[PDB]
Amino acid sequence: PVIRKFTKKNVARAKKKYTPFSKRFKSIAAIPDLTSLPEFYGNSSELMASRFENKLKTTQKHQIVETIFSKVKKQLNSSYLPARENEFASIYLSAYSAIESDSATTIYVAGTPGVGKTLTVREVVKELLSSSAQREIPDFLYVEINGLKMVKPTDCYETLWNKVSGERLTWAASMESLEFYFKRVPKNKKKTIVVLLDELDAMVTKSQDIMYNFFNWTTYENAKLIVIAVANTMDLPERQLGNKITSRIGFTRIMFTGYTHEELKNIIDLRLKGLNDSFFYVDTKTGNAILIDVRKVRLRMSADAIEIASRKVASVSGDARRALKVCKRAAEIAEKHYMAKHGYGYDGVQTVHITHVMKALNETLNSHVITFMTRLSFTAKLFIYALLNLMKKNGSQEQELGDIVDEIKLLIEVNGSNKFVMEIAKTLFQQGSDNISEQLRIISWDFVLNQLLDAGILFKQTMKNDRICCVKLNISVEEAKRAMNEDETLRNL
Amino acid sequence: NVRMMLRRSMYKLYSAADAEEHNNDVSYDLSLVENFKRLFGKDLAMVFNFKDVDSINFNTLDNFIILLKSAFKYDHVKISLIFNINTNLSNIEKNLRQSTIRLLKRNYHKLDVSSNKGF
Amino acid sequence: MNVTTPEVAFREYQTNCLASYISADPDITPSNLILQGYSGTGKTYTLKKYFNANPNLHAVWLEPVELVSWKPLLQAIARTVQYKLKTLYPNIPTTDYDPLQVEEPFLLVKTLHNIFVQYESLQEKTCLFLILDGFDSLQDLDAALFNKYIKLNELLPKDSKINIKFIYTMLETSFLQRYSTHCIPTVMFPRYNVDEVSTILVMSRCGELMEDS
Amino acid sequence: EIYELEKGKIGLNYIAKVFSKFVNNNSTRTRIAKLNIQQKLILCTIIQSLKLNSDATIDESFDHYIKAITKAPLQRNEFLEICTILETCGLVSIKKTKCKGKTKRFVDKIDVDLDMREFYDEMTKISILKPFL
Amino acid sequence: DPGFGSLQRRLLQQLYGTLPTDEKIIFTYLQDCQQEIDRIIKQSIIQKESHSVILVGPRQSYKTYLLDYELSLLQQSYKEQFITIRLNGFIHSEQTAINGIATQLEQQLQKIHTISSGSLTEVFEKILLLLDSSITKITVVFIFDEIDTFAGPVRQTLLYNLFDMVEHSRVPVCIFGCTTKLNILEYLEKRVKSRFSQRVIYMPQIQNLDDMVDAVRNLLTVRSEISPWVSQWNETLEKELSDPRSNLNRHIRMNFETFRSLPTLKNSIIPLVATSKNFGSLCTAIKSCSFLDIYNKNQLSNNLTGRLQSLSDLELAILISAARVALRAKDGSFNFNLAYAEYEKMIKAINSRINTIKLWLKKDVKNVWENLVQLDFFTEKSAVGLRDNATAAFYASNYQFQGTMIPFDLRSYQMQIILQELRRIIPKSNMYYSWTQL
């Protein structure tokens, strides 16, 4: 038949309809009551997610063994609170004064990552669902739009209209459908919907039209939506959104500030209230601890260890997740000590203390580049030394490679007295043998270029001439200076 | 560049082979020249024709001639090259590379096509 | 091993160091092997002489100079592996997959996996030698394509009966000095000597001069 | 809405609240929040890393560091995590930019936002941040 | 005899690492870091906890080796309790990673007892309701190879979703990231860092020379008694490794100062063991190390010295004249006309002092000039070589450069090998050796 210019044999199209909600009936006066419709708002076939559930469950077998520290490493996972009250109260009031008043508000929260904003927002929505179950308010359909959980930044329309309506269209039909449903359909036939815009600064793409529409459907009188959009920087509509959309977002702008050391200590106290200073019935044979041969054991997650883990993480960025990561690494270190000391293996009291949590606090404050450039090869340290002493002559940070080569040759020829360098300068140029001429480059030159290029110490510009290819120290010069002073041979060479 | 020459050349080859016959989709490279004998059943004799040889890159042209030279090993092809030059031959064999020139010195013929020669 | 070293006239180190790296047992064989040389330095001649001296092990001859960008390279790999297996073990049900379906490196992985898991009906695990003769002779070539062929045996299954073993052929030595930390076995081919050229030409050409009418 | 959080005298602290919240304090809370001297003199290191180079790499913010204090060790991790405090408050911008230079691959940058008028009055109380200006 | 081939096959199997997983060796300098990987991975296939680690170490530093040793050690008993999702950072771009996870979640749950089908949105939602959602579940072990490409400086969506199903999931995951950058935590976007468990474990390098000879002792000794020769072959090995003045210890000593790596030693030792034919021949071949200087000579046989050695005489005069012209200029550029205006001047000064050298015309020095750019003795003026990615090698394949449209003998080339480096490598018994001074 035809001979085609190229082929698209691996193409997969969804089953999604093109005609929007505006052309269902073509009668605005005869729109049916959308709330108690069979398909709308999740009233039919809501097993549409729980099809894949009996795939990742296999055998209920073989008697898994918990330990004395496996309990704390389970309670330090993702899961009143004395942390966020003046934010929870204002957000729940600002979202309750629109649920009761059939309004169209927009709340704006923001904060550096870890300050509990999505936790308080989801608890606000859980409490408002409890209020809807107590029937002091109307009910709503809850939609969470995560900014990064989607492959296309315009799929927000598709998932919002799908969650509202039970039908899935393409993204253009979904945005026209949502535009009609939020402009023209009267407030007697729509129950309200609350929208969580999780990680808003990932849908600003190329038009700002999604950011336009989700904050311009809320300026309408006939649309009962509440947008509780979270963010990652407080001045986001002053940096990357227009001033008109800044006026749309408005003036609420409730910031989730960082935590304090007292708040973080209270957080770890509530996380370990059920386990600290309690009693466990371990067995000498395995180690299987059970909370209320058999040994009654305490567990002192010490408050000084908690507060010295909390003060540093309260200083740096104040995150109630990084505090849990520190206090879980401490329990991991304790469990490793316990299992290695007792020979237990998988199938007195126990403590977590200051000089035991300092390893968990020091595991993320180590630059393993100095202990890398010390264990580097001699030719790689000689490369770094040639680059380091060319810098005092030049002052560019961007030395060529033909210069490094001649500087290495200069150092080897000008040190002809040292016993180490006369033993090594034969092998450095000829691999210790004859029937090999004196090479222009040292042996392992491309190897120690690449071993620093892949490691990110070195930084070479792309070109075909490996005499004028510039080379930069990507890490630093001060740490290279402090790493080249422990060699016993390069300290004089 | 070289790949558009190859894709256009094998596209024209597969078009002028499958439309002069009176069904699968192949990739447009010299593999079609390799298995032209078993795709169709006929021997290949493609005659190339470069229109403004003084206006192509000769750097792309000798790369295309090198890329064509590997078609010799397939025993059913016969490549013929036709160069339409609007200048002299000392300006084509100055810009080409010498190995391509010694490959082109195997069965070359010249032909003066101009309506001022031979009034 | 049980391989037969060929009597190539002036590459004596290279055929010994080539029978030390190409065998019929997939455990005593590297997963990648470079044969870096220059133009005319005897790579293809000693490769064909080796693989003709050992008829039992299976070759796949692929030349990425007539396959310009990387997509016809993947399509040609997935085509000719399947075509080689069809004429090697004929009595296996071989459901023909289309090589044009390969559009990305991942689809080459998936296609070759679906080709290989249908030959589990054999007895013992074999290796298939895919030769990329002239990998630096790729026309629309980039510096990060070779990383996609080093880390391909990392994706083919481990307890499989047909294992892909690559044999590259480079030509440029500034190409190869980028993939030096990958520690692939490199067998370098140094340029011929005047005393060796003067008799390589004699043993190659003085048959077709007396038989030149 | 802030009237209902007690269960023109209160319709003013919001603007006096959202103006001060965005403003915070240019110099009064600057050192107050810094309270730590190591969270104070580094901002002067970034101030001295602007009138020599506009490509202020954190290395250049750390090569300036061992051209000032060279008179318990200190690694680069302490510097680049104490800079997160100046990131968390909302003064400094560290992200990846083009890094023009000679080669065009990404690296960290440093930038400051407020004009050097009130910060120059903020140093009038600290006797060690006066020679560094 | 069929007694020697068993010893040779066992030796080459130990040298490749293709042993069964009970005699597979672990070197002593990487036995502590195998304990940490074993601790991490053994509390996720057994205890069903979920976490994320990043393995940082250079190339050929035994990361895939250790991980496959664990995954083959946690398969002899707990086969049905885990599935593995391995994906590179090279062959899996960030749009083709979703199809990789979906194809590898589909075909792995098939072998125990359609999620691959749909568009990219449907597939990415079909694998977000499966992972992000007495009994025992199945855990997924993600193996991210070269994770520093998924941590690019734009979005980091795949890392956010994968590290987000660590705290916030019901399925136990355990995700391994093998990378090479030491500054890997500076790459991650600040909300993917907060989801990260911050447990990056650096691979160990070789600190002592004793570690290298103990590693070669572990690699080349034989534990299982298969051949009759093994009772000699161990002892004749130790006689080379205990004596610090032999050839094998000297080659290990010069490997410790050069590329400090065991796989380069493996590629040295493998054609030594495989080219040998008898046991006494193998014994004297590892006594003398008669192959670790044949091979090591061949590895340098054409870089810039073993192929300049194979230059002809006119080509050498052309290279010397071109390096003279580039040495005389300011920034180091020249062309064919400036090079031939030094070849004839030098050769006329050769025929002045004296039987001679035939001056080849400029119709034949063109072939010589083209043969010295196909050996990389000249580059162009600013021509960058292979581009970094695949698009920048496409964006320039449509560009028509100005250095290839000008005539041939005006292209401003540039030297690969300067005249000082040409002075010391040409032998002093040459008729152009005096012409390499300036």
Ligand SMILES: Nc1ncnc2c1ncn2[C@@H]1O[C@H](COP(=O)(O)OP(=O)(O)OP(O)(O)=S)[C@@H](O)[C@H]1O
């Ligand atoms: N006051 C708190 N009480 C309990 N958990 C908390 C608290 N604050 C933060 N967290 C932890 O943080 C998680 C909730 O995520 P959040 O940090 O609120 O989201 P976020 O601040 O937007 O972070 P990003 O940047 O969006 S990944 C929970 O799993 C908690 O473990």
Ligand SMILES: Nc1ncnc2c1ncn2[C@@H]1O[C@H](COP(=O)(O)OP(=O)(O)OP(O)(O)=S)[C@@H](O)[C@H]1O
């Ligand atoms: N040792 C040899 N003995 C006999 N003939 C040889 C020998 N070496 C080369 N030749 C001949 O010269 C030719 C050289 O071509 P190849 O062996 O293919 O070299 P080559 O490196 O593959 O060239 P490239 O890389 O494809 S440009 C062979 O085809 C033989 O005809």
Ligand SMILES: Nc1ncnc2c1ncn2[C@@H]1O[C@H](COP(=O)(O)OP(=O)(O)OP(O)(O)=S)[C@@H](O)[C@H]1O
């Ligand atoms: N699965 C495996 N089975 C046997 N040998 C292996 C395996 N993986 C690697 N090796 C060998 O181990 C040595 C180096 O191991 P690698 O795992 O490849 O190093 P590496 O850390 O993976 O390098 P990367 O992945 O680029 S950081 C080489 O001799 C490999 O052949």
Ligand SMILES: [Mg+2]
């Ligand atoms: Mg969140």
Ligand SMILES: [Mg+2]
């Ligand atoms: Mg060849």
Ligand SMILES: [Mg+2]
């Ligand atoms: Mg890897």
